[PDB]
Amino acid sequence: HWGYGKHNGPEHWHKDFPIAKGERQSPVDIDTHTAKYDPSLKPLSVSYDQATSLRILNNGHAFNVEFDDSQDKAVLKGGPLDGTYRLIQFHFHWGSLDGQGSEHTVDKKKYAAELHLVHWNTKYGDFGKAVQQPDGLAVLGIFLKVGSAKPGLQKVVDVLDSIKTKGKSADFTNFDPRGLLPESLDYWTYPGSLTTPPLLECVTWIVLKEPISVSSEQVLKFRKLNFNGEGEPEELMVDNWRPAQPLKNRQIKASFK
Numbered sequence: 001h002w003g004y005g006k007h008n009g010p011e012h013w014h015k016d017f018p019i020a021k022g023e024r025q026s027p028v029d030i031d032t033h034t035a036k037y038d039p040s041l042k043p044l045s046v047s048y049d050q051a052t053s054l055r056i057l058n059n060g061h062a063f064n065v066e067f068d069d070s071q072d073k074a075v076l077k078g079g080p081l082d083g084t085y086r087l088i089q090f091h092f093h094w095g096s097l098d099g100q101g102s103e104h105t106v107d108k109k110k111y112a113a114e115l116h117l118v119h120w121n122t123k124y125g126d127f128g129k130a131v132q133q134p135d136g137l138a139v140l141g142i143f144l145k146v147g148s149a150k151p152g153l154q155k156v157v158d159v160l161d162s163i164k165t166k167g168k169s170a171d172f173t174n175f176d177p178r179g180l181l182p183e184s185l186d187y188w189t190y191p192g193s194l195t196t197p198p199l200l201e202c203v204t205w206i207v208l209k210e211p212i213s214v215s216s217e218q219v220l221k222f223r224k225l226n227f228n229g230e231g232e233p234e235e236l237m238v239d240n241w242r243p244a245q246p247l248k249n250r251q252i253k254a255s256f257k
Ligand SMILES: CC(C)NC[C@H](O)COc1ccc(S(N)(=O)=O)cc1
Pocket: 001, 002, 003, 007, 008, 009, 012, 013, 014, 015, 016, 017
């Protein structure tokens, strides 16, 4: 199956997922001098106060913190979006070293990691229907750099020991994702795709300009996770990022001057 190794990584994905070479693939490089300020872009509305987290899962490619998305409890609206998008999960992509790990890049700069808060459009009823639509998902992407610790991340870091290997899960209730946001909500936005198979072209990407800082100890604990299942030869879960894809016939818009 697909992965991030030499024999199943991003250069192989097109053989089972031909949309890998499609017209609106993600991630991309964000050329800050080419992105156009769009004064018609509305401010983002992040309403996470009623969020209900449930569980954290090692799925063999990353770890997902999952939410109750059966009601409008934690939603994203505004910005480039029409309608209401419900938070279903967040996850990260990260590197084996601090100089790499993010999926999007900014003027070719790579950050140490990237957080993805995944939301689906409520007019399609459920997540599986939404991923079949060009405006079905909105993913809020947030860069991580290494510096001071992020206090709101520590609860996640401290549970990773219990989900070391693929298929393990743990209860993860009462987690507040507001503690993972930077101060500013200035953003870039463009139409794109899931960055892992099935690579569906269903995502409005909203990438925040301001990174969050995490400590070296926090990201070191990400790197102790395993791609493999329990009892299998250990493969550290590192460098689970897809590189930048061709922008093709797309414009990146900026919410800020
Ligand atoms: C785990 C054992 C069966 N070995 C796996 C097997 O060789 C499959 O190899 C592959 C290699 C690449 C892919 S793709 N186009 O999804 O990235 C799929 C299967």
